[PDB]
Write an enzyme that holds these catalytic residues in place. Structure first.
Site, PDB file in Angstrom:
ATOM      1  N   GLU A 166       0.795  -1.355   0.077  1.00 19.12           N
ATOM      2  CA  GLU A 166       0.104  -0.075  -0.058  1.00 19.12           C
ATOM      3  C   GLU A 166       0.839   1.205   0.060  1.00 19.12           C
ATOM      4  O   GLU A 166       0.470   2.365  -0.707  1.00 19.12           O
ATOM      5  CB  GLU A 166      -0.803   0.092   1.166  1.00 19.12           C
ATOM      6  N   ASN A 178      -7.472   9.199  -5.239  1.00 17.57           N
ATOM      7  CA  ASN A 178      -8.465   8.294  -5.835  1.00 17.57           C
ATOM      8  C   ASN A 178      -9.329   9.127  -7.031  1.00 17.57           C
ATOM      9  O   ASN A 178      -9.452  10.430  -6.950  1.00 17.57           O
ATOM     10  CB  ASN A 178      -9.560   7.682  -4.883  1.00 17.57           C
ATOM     11  N   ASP A 183     -12.358   9.393  -7.442  1.00 19.62           N
ATOM     12  CA  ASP A 183     -13.784  10.108  -7.096  1.00 19.62           C
ATOM     13  C   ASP A 183     -13.449  11.541  -6.037  1.00 19.62           C
ATOM     14  O   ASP A 183     -14.210  11.984  -5.461  1.00 19.62           O
ATOM     15  CB  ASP A 183     -14.500   9.129  -6.187  1.00 19.62           C
ATOM     16  N   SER A 200     -11.684  11.308  -3.459  1.00 18.97           N
ATOM     17  CA  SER A 200     -11.223  11.142  -2.008  1.00 18.97           C
ATOM     18  C   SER A 200      -9.535  10.552  -2.123  1.00 18.97           C
ATOM     19  O   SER A 200      -8.975  10.435  -3.193  1.00 18.97           O
ATOM     20  CB  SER A 200     -11.939   9.799  -1.622  1.00 18.97           C
ATOM     21  N   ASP A 237      -6.164   8.541  -0.123  1.00 19.67           N
ATOM     22  CA  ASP A 237      -5.619   7.480   0.497  1.00 19.67           C
ATOM     23  C   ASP A 237      -4.396   8.086   1.408  1.00 19.67           C
ATOM     24  O   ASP A 237      -3.701   8.661   0.768  1.00 19.67           O
ATOM     25  CB  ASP A 237      -5.228   6.125   0.048  1.00 19.67           C
ATOM     26  N   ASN A 291      -8.912   5.397   3.279  1.00 18.38           N
ATOM     27  CA  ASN A 291      -9.642   6.103   2.445  1.00 18.38           C
ATOM     28  C   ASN A 291     -10.389   7.372   3.166  1.00 18.38           C
ATOM     29  O   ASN A 291     -11.054   6.833   3.942  1.00 18.38           O
ATOM     30  CB  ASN A 291     -10.346   5.413   1.649  1.00 18.38           C
ATOM     31  N   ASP A 340     -15.098  -4.470   9.818  1.00 19.97           N
ATOM     32  CA  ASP A 340     -16.325  -3.715   9.032  1.00 19.97           C
ATOM     33  C   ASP A 340     -17.025  -5.124   8.265  1.00 19.97           C
ATOM     34  O   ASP A 340     -18.170  -4.586   7.807  1.00 19.97           O
ATOM     35  CB  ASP A 340     -15.939  -2.740   8.248  1.00 19.97           C
TER      36      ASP A 340
END
Length: 129
Positions: free
Chosen positions: A35, A46, A48, A50, A52, A59, A101
């Site tokens: 990562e 990203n 969209d 957003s 990281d 995110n 989650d």
């Protein structure tokens, strides 16, 4: 800061990630490797809008506030910048929420594509027990 492999494994073990939710330590180290290349300061935007953040590329769309992701959620109740510290505590605590989650470590695309189903124990050989 750029962690060494064994240094990160030890910090992660000390923060309770070994076998957290059934994921051995090797999985978390492998995930961090792909990562962020072990760099606490890694950021990636990203498509969209957003972003990281940090050693596990958490995110801003769901997990942290960076003030510039309209519609974002901040489920870990932290500014995203706290994920860039040389102290990985905030990253680890937020990662624990993420992996709980329901999707487990599949929430990390690089874990899914590059760590899952591999010999992840190789990522901790040579660390002190």
């Amino acid at each position: 800061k750029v962690f060494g492999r064994c240094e990160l494994a030890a910090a992660m073990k000390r923060h309770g990630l070994d076998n957290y939710r059934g994921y051995s330590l090797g999985n978390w180290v492998c995930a961090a490797k792909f990562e962020s290349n072990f760099n606490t300061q890694a950021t990636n935007r990203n498509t969209d809008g957003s972003t990281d953040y940090g050693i596990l590329q958490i995110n801003s769309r769901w997990w942290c506030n960076d003030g510039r992701t309209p519609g974002s959620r901040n489920l870990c109740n932290i500014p995203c910048s706290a994920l860039l510290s040389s102290d990985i505590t905030a990253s680890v605590n937020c990662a624990k929420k993420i992996v709980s989650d329901g999707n487990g470590m599949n929430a990390w695309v690089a874990w899914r594509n590059r760590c899952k189903g591999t010999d992840v124990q190789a990522w901790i050989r040579g660390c002190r027990l």
